[PDB]
Amino acid sequence: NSRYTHFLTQHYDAKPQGRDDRYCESIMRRRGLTSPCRDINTFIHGNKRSIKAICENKNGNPHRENLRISKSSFQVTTCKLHGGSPWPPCQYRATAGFRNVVVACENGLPVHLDQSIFRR
């Protein structure tokens, strides 16, 4: 279940404080997403068990072809790449949000975040 682990690395941050541009620039580095700079990436906050619950009917509904959509809303932060280059230094604009999320699940664990709902 390294895909679950990969999901957490790319898309989970339990307790941020700020959630500003600087937060994005830092955490995108910390999580290895800056070579090349990922165009857009969203982190989910709070506890893990609520996110795992999306894979059950406890906190999820089936969605489109192969995805799950959460019933609860999550605090999230979307980091969007600013500037012309794919390469570091990666400047990010932060957007804090509060809504449900879309994931793909495998063996009851989230393994993908659908980034499309945050492209705005």
Residue numbers in the entry: 3 to 122
Excerpt from the publication:
ANG residues H13, K40 and H114 (part of the P1 sub-site) correspond to the catalytic triad. K40 is a key residue at the catalytic centre of ANG and adopts multiple conformation in the native structure. However the conservative substitution of Arg for K40 reduces the activity to ~6%, similar to the effect of the K41 to Arg mutation in RNase A43. In the crystal structure of the ALS variant K40R, the Arg side chain possesses a single conformation and several key interactions of K40 (with residues Q12, C39, N43 and T44, which are integral to the catalytic site) known to be important for the stabilization of the pentavalent transition state during RNA cleavage are lost. Instead, in the variant, the Arg side-chain makes direct interaction with Q112 by reorienting its side chain (more solvent exposed).
Angiogenin (ANG), a 14-kDa basic protein is an angiogenic ribonuclease and member of the bovine pancreatic ribonuclease (RNase A) family (also known as RNase 5). Like RNase A, ANG cleaves preferentially on the 3′ side of pyrimidines and follows a transphosphorylation/hydrolysis mechanism. In addition, the crystal structure of human ANG has revealed that it has an RNase A fold and the catalytic triad (residues H13, K40 and H114) is conserved. The enzymatic activity of ANG is several orders of magnitude lower than that of RNase A towards conventional RNase substrates, but essential for its angiogenic effect.
